[PDB]
Amino acid sequence: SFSAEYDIVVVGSGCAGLTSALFSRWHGNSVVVLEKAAALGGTTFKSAFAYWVPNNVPMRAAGIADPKPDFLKYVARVTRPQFYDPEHPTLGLTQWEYDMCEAIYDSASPAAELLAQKGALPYRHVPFATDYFSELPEDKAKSGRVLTPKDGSPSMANGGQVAIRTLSTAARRDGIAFKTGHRVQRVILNSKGEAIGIEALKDDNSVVRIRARKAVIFGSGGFTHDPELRSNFLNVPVYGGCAAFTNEGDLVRITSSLGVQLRNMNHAWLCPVTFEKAIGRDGSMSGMFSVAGDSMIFVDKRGKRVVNEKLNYNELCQKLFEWDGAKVEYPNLVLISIWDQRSQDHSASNDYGSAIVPPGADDRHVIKSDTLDGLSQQISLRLKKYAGQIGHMELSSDFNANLRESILRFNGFASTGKDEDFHRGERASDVLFNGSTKKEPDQKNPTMWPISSVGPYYAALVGGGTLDTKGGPKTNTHGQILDIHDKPIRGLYGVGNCVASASSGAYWAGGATLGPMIAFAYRAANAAHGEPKRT
Amino acid sequence: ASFSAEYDIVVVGSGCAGLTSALFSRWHGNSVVVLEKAAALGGTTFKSAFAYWVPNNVPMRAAGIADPKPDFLKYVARVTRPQFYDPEHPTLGLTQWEYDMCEAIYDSASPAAELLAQKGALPYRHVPFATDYFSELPEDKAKSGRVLTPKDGSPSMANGGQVAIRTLSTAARRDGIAFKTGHRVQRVILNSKGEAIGIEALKDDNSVVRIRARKAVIFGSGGFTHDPELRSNFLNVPVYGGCAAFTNEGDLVRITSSLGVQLRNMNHAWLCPVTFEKAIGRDGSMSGMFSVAGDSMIFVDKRGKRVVNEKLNYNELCQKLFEWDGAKVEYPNLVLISIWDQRSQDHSASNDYGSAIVPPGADDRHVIKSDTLDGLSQQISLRLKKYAGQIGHMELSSDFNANLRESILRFNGFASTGKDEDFHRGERASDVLFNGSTKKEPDQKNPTMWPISSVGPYYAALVGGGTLDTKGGPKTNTHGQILDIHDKPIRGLYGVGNCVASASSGAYWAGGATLGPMIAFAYRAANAAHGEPKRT
Ligand SMILES: *Cc1cc2c(cc1C)nc1c(=O)[nH]c(=O)nc-1n2C[C@H](O)[C@H](O)[C@H](O)COP(=O)(O)OP(=O)(O)OC[C@H]1O[C@@H](n2cnc3c(N)ncnc32)[C@H](O)[C@@H]1O
Ligand SMILES: Cc1cc2nc3c(=O)[nH]c(=O)nc-3n(C[C@H](O)[C@H](O)[C@H](O)COP(=O)(O)OP(=O)(O)OC[C@H]3O[C@@H](n4cnc5c(N)ncnc54)[C@H](O)[C@@H]3O)c2cc1C
Structure with a gap:
């Protein structure tokens, strides 16, 4: 009873x-x-x-x-x-x-x-x-x-x-x-x-x-x-x-x-997440519904763009779990969001799962360096820290060269306003969750702006998570x-x-x-x- | 009781x-x-x-x-x-x-x-x-x-x-x-x-x-x-x-x-590609495609481009068919098209292990055939139309014919050097191991590839994703x-x-x-x- x-x-x-x-x-x-x-x-x-x-x-x-x-x-x-x-x-x-x-x-x-x-x-x-x-x-x-x-x-x-x-x-x-x-x-x-x-x-x-x-x-x-x-x-x-x-x-x-x-x-309802916050069980964490930054790209461990970073969260998360049967690994298991001082200063947010966070926020997930080569060294340390969760993933030996090439290519797309590889900004939803950006006279596409040729440079690991299951x-x-x-x-x-x-x-x-x-x-x-x- | x-x-x-x-x-x-x-x-x-x-x-x-x-x-x-x-x-x-x-x-x-x-x-x-x-x-x-x-x-x-x-x-x-x-x-x-x-x-x-x-x-x-x-x-x-x-x-x-x-x-599940028409048609004698037959053979998507190593282990290859394109709300590879020539028809056909290339007398309802590549694409289109309600009303791209010619020129280069620069076909042991039968060719550097014929007839079959069973x-x-x-x-x-x-x-x-x-x-x-x- x-x-x-x-x-x-x-x-x-x-x-x-x-x-x-x-x-x-x-x-x-x-x-x-x-x-x-x-x-x-x-x-x-x-x-x-x-x-x-x-x-x-x-x-x-x-x-x-x-x-x-x-x-x-x-x-x-x-x-x-x-x-x-x-x-x-x-x-x-x-x-x-x-x-x-x-x-x-x-x-x-x-x-x-x-x-x-x-x-x-x-x-x-x-x-x-x-x-x-x-x-x-x-x-x-x-x-x-x-x-x-x-x-x-x-x-x-x-x-x-x-x-x-x-x-x-x-x-x-x-x-x-x-x-x-x-x-x-x-x-x-x-x-x-x-x-x-x-x-x-x-x-x-x-x-x-x-x-x-x-x-x-x-x-x-x-x-x-x-x-x-x-x-x-x-x-x-x-x-x-x-x-x-x-x-x-x-x-x-x-x-x-x-x-x-x-x-x-x-x-599940899917979304990318700030990887270190998911592993570390941060209860205040949001799914990354808005991927912050216009002078910002995602690269894989080879230093290449693989996806439209502004793609709807439920779809973008799926990219992280593409399977490489030949190498018995998930090539995109974590992606690296990389941004510059302009995005740091003008795209930071405490909301909507942004990895770019304003002064005073918890920044333990943010990787920082004064050169691109230094950043890759810092990213490597972070991958090593979480090796047992991510298949002992490493940056490729040609990471730094590929990254420079990726940034040059993206910078072209950001100038013309046309992302020939992944069509960033071409669907309304890309603009919808674009986040804050520094206003620029004659920015052609609000979702892209050339990455600065000087540092500091910032990065964060992005992994796949849920809002919840369904x-x-x-x-x-x-x-x-x-x-x-x-x-x-x-x-x-x-x-x-x-x-x-x-x-x-x-x-x-x-x-x-x-x-x-x-x-x-x-x-x-x-x-x-x-x-x-x-x- | x-x-x-x-x-x-x-x-x-x-x-x-x-x-x-x-x-x-x-x-x-x-x-x-x-x-x-x-x-x-x-x-x-x-x-x-x-x-x-x-x-x-x-x-x-x-x-x-x-x-x-x-x-x-x-x-x-x-x-x-x-x-x-x-x-x-x-x-x-x-x-x-x-x-x-x-x-x-x-x-x-x-x-x-x-x-x-x-x-x-x-x-x-x-x-x-x-x-x-x-x-x-x-x-x-x-x-x-x-x-x-x-x-x-x-x-x-x-x-x-x-x-x-x-x-x-x-x-x-x-x-x-x-x-x-x-x-x-x-x-x-x-x-x-x-x-x-x-x-x-x-x-x-x-x-x-x-x-x-x-x-x-x-x-x-x-x-x-x-x-x-x-x-x-x-x-x-x-x-x-x-x-x-x-x-x-x-x-x-x-x-x-x-x-x-x-x-x-x-x-x-235990996964494998399948001859798509046999899955839809509930052919009970169907096998998973454990060996993808043919060396003068490629898989193309509906754009007429190669997207994958066709010789990849079946449990892994099946997964390629379910890649998701969120921007277009479609599965780009939902079915792939295996295309082969008379040499592969004659020398790679098999009644075993789920091969799409089958010898005379085998059930060949799933085989699409034409004398020319342009004719083949028209035939492939009719097949896609027949199964539209299963495959998102998928259509060949308007530039399919031209893309396919480019894909074959690229592949034919790879087949002559023995090196597939795009998808590394033949570079892992299992690609060679499960390659199936081929015509012996003294000049062949890589057993998994041979140039596709410059003349027809040409053959094709739709490949979809299936299981052996669940686990x-x-x-x-x-x-x-x-x-x-x-x-x-x-x-x-x-x-x-x-x-x-x-x-x-x-x-x-x-x-x-x-x-x-x-x-x-x-x-x-x-x-x-x-x-x-x-x-x-
Ligand atoms: C499809 C296939 C799979 C396969 C293979 C070749 C083909 C064409 N070759 C293989 C190989 O060489 N080596 C290997 O390791 N696996 C291979 N596979 C996969 C393999 O065949 C299966 O994994 C395996 O045979 C499964 O064995 P299992 O005993 O678990 O299952 P089953 O053979 O399907 O038998 C189940 C039987 O149970 C009966 N059944 C179902 N429901 C009921 C109820 N309610 N009551 C009574 N009986 C029931 C089914 O009718 C069936 O007979
Ligand atoms: C940061 C974030 C932002 C989101 N924004 C949106 C949005 O704007 N719009 C939208 O549509 N969706 C959004 N989602 C998804 C959305 O929040 C959820 O889908 C929705 O809130 C789920 O509500 P629910 O009542 O099913 O569960 P919840 O809100 O999770 O509540 C379930 C409750 O049940 C309790 N519970 C669990 N087990 C037991 C038990 N055994 N006994 C008693 N209680 C139990 C839990 O403690 C919890 O309080 C967002 C998700 C997140 C994470």
């Missing part, structure tokens, strides 16, 4: 849990939110809280249609490229993927509107944020879908903190109970196999059992920080990610005897966790990164994690409200 | 894992049944060459070829976990589990092979020339010698699997192992203490049968290549299928979903015992072969690197299962 009882028990206090809790409470249920950490907010707290809301009221107010068939074609084209077909009944998606994407379109705006109306998540529009693949002809609403917390800073970097504040303030105002230091570790079933509550491990190592009359809703985030799970499931061998450190995939263990379908386990128990479009016959496990719900995303390995646009997540919190809460009170 | 039959040991699947597990079990004196889902025995194993890679095997020792254990471990460690391999680390940078599993392979494969041969179940011959796939690594101290093959396999060895299933199943029958075909196991039955006490299987006629196991249920049920949902949701690359038996649909993943197991290595599933210890989430055996429950987690990660060490380890674990599993008390 149990020491407490509520209509709805919510696990986790990021976006998925707080919104699920609020929607549940507003239907009149009693609700508790159980949080494993000492503080609320999880990864959501660290985010910019961009949220991508199709057919939102700001768009409609501007007379911008977001036609539903074209919304589905955009997400289908990006999510399942090989199979996308406009003439196919579900656009080449499976029925489940199609229905999930449809649910996002149907429910995101009503969810966003209700949260705002109740003062839980007031927003402003981000009209100029373009979708990450807006150039595709399938995208018929290329900008307009993004919302952000109303009181977020101009950079929006603190959006997640603002959102956790407004969400949790409304939750307290409306009588939702909170318990921190409660690590849920078990779902309790009745004799009919229905979820009737949880067991949680407390700080002092005692367990408590808490009954849920109607539903247990998991919003417990991903598994980035269980290295075993991460390594065994993800399609790339990432070194970590900006996910909260308490996101260790507990739901995967919780459901291991429940007969669930683990889906999309092979995918695989877990499969749900229906109402957030109900399914058994292997696709039938709900009665009373059991999941929302957010702890369950399977329908987005496969794709990242549609800024806010493509939180926008869908709010839609499903709303659908989950609406369904959970309809549950009979049991046991 | 009750059971309609009872045995000491119940074995699920009749490929290598199941037959060997069953035989070892029976020879300890247990009663044994083998439950096979299909109408026929043998699974993927039946289709294989039955190369099996057996470290420190008796033929090697008899020939005076050393295979020191510490160096064996460094070879497999270096290949398996490249980022973390470290000769100074106590487990070489592997996890304790991976290290222990690799050690078990070295310790147990040879005694397993010896016993199966002694009993006449798997007589073998040595294949002294079969060389490891990364033989150039200094860690490999026994670069050749580890491979065995069924004694009566053909000279090419291509029917080895059929011979092995014949000798194994004949011995099994001889020694009183029971067989039930058309029995699709779908559930493990537990007692009140949560121990495995038997199975439920679905029969062809849709009746269900419950069969008690006194000591152990051993799964040898193969991988999940042919469950598209599981394949698509777990593997690190979006493969189109594979040469796995079509009945390999990952049943064990569903069976164990309520048993609290740890699914491990789910992100990896993730419930984690076992080195004794084949399926573990719960606290790393403790689920009593009575065993798994061997592709249905459980391989310790090889995404790596393919050598020819026979699936079957060799597999026999080691069948032996260890059977030895442990024999030790189980009789229960329920």
Whole structure:
């Protein structure tokens, strides 16, 4: 038996849990939110809280249609490229993927509107944020879908903190109970196999059992920080990610005897990371969404550019895991970001995972030297320090010569404004996350400027990480966790990164994690409200 | 509820894992049944060459070829976990589990092979020339010698699997192992203490049968290549299928979903290029493309440019096909086009090892043909159109013809000097080793290349990425015992072969690197299962 009882028990206090809790409470249920950490907010707290809301009221107010068939074609084209077909009944998606994407379109705006109306998540529009693949002809609403917390800073970097504040303030105002230091570790079933509550491990190592009359809703985030799970499931061998450190995939263990379908386990939301911060478990670390610097290139261990440094983070991270079967190594396992004094002075940022950081910031990851040859010596020392993580990678014997050639070639591209090798700056999204730069009259392309012929020169190692994972128990479009016959496990719900995303390995646009997540919190809460009170 | 039959040991699947597990079990004196889902025995194993890679095997020792254990471990460690391999680390940078599993392979494969041969179940011959796939690594101290093959396999060895299933199943029958075909196991039955006490299987006629196991249920049920949902949701690359038996649909993943197991290595398969049209068309006789045929032959992408060494090890080459172009939201190499001339048609064709170049009389529906290169590109275009819904509506670039001419001029230079400046074709031993048949040419500096003909006819085939089978599933210890989430055996429950987690990660060490380890674990599993008390 149990020491407490509520209509709805919510696990986790990021976006998925707080919104699920609020929607549940507003239907009149009693609700508790159980949080494993000492503080609320999880990864959501660290985010910019961009949220991508199709057919939102700001768009409609501007007379911008977001036609539903074209919304589905955009997400289908990006999510399942090989199979996308406009003439196919579900656009080449499976029925489940199609229905999930449809649910996002149907429910995101009503969810966003209700949260705002109740003062839980007031927003402003981000009209100029373009979708990450807006150039595709399938995208018929290329900008307009993004919302952000109303009181977020101009950079929006603190959006997640603002959102956790407004969400949790409304939750307290409306009588939702909170318990921190409660690590849920078990779902309790009745004799009919229905979820009737949880067991949680407390700080002092005692367990408590808490009954849920109607539903247990998991919003417990991903598994980035269980290295075993991460390594065994993800399609790339990432070194970590900006996910909260308490996101260790507990739901995967919780459901291991429940007969669930683990889906999309092979995918994470990907991003490059400041490699030394991932290895060193810096909890304040962000994914490198904006690769800082215009007088800045990435080179491999041969001293050559291999990629557009301004490419969308979810795609750029994948470059780091290209495999060289002939040499039995990952040639790009870490890349080296190299920049000059101009970028140091005018492109530094504490936000969006920039490796270029302003005076006073933690600079332990920054490598520095007065010559290019000196820099390579310093980079070598850094590679040696982390040898056991990166295959004992070394700079090639012709590194310095190749680097000089790479800088000369790039400097040409920066003069003409045309990167003939990797097309840096030619897609809108490259400009979108370009970061701060020193204004230069008659810079031809804002993403490039010639690297100075004098030092000092700076560098940082860039490795591959996650925002968090996006695989877990499969749900229906109402957030109900399914058994292997696709039938709900009665009373059991999941929302957010702890369950399977329908987005496969794709990242549609800024806010493509939180926008869908709010839609499903709303659908989950609406369904959970309809549950009979049991046991 | 009750059971309609009872045995000491119940074995699920009749490929290598199941037959060997069953035989070892029976020879300890247990009663044994083998439950096979299909109408026929043998699974993927039946289709294989039955190369099996057996470290420190008796033929090697008899020939005076050393295979020191510490160096064996460094070879497999270096290949398996490249980022973390470290000769100074106590487990070489592997996890304790991976290290222990690799050690078990070295310790147990040879005694397993010896016993199966002694009993006449798997007589073998040595294949002294079969060389490891990364033989150039200094860690490999026994670069050749580890491979065995069924004694009566053909000279090419291509029917080895059929011979092995014949000798194994004949011995099994001889020694009183029971067989039930058309029995699709779908559930493990537990007692009140949560121990495995038997199975439920679905029969062809849709009746269900419950069969008690006194000591152990051993799964040898193969991988999940042919469950598209599981394949698509777990593997690190979006493969189109594979040469796995079509009945390999990952049943064990569903069976164990309520048993609290740890699914491990789910992100990896044994990978290989495939003749794309045979994967899409579900040709059950299809083999992975283990040798890419032809010396006067190149692979081009849809731009008409070479992108890869066509002679690269199959498990590595397959990965090239899934390179991702984030800027264009496409897989640039999703299919590559193998193009060859009459010389390669005549002298490199093969019915074996997944060759796209096939001799007269072989099924050649996948072969595209034209008298001119310009005609060939028109023919290739029609083929891409036919499969548009599978390959992102990929098209040849508008400058395909001109690029191809340039690619062939470049390659023809490389073929005459013997030096492929772009992709180093022929510079690693395995490129030469798996090069396939070629017309002997006195003037040839590099056996893997010869100039492409200045006249037609020309031939082409689409190449896509596939599997041999998957290699993730419930984690076992080195004794084949399926573990719960606290790393403790689920009593009575065993798994061997592709249905459980391989310790090889995404790596393919050598020819026979699936079957060799597999026999080691069948032996260890059977030895442990024999030790189980009789229960329920
Ligand atoms: C495709 C292929 C693979 C291959 C090869 C050549 C080809 C064309 N050559 C190889 C080689 O020479 N050496 C080597 O090491 N590997 C080679 N491979 C890979 C290899 O064939 C496989 O790794 C290996 O044979 C797998 O053996 P295993 O015993 O694990 O699996 P199987 O042979 O596929 O048999 C599984 C059987 O189980 C039955 N099954 C499936 N589900 C059920 C249920 N529910 N109940 C009962 N039986 C079930 C399948 O029907 C199958 O028969
Ligand atoms: C720096 C950064 C910036 C980002 N910016 C954006 C952005 O602007 N827009 C966007 O769409 N996405 C963004 N993302 C991704 C986004 O933050 C996440 O996808 C989203 O916040 C996940 O929310 P969630 O509720 O699923 O999980 P989380 O916010 O991670 O919350 C899960 C919570 O569950 C708790 N928990 C875990 N296990 C248990 C247990 N056993 N019992 C109890 N509680 C448990 C955790 O401690 C945690 O508090 C960003 C990510 C990062 C790292």
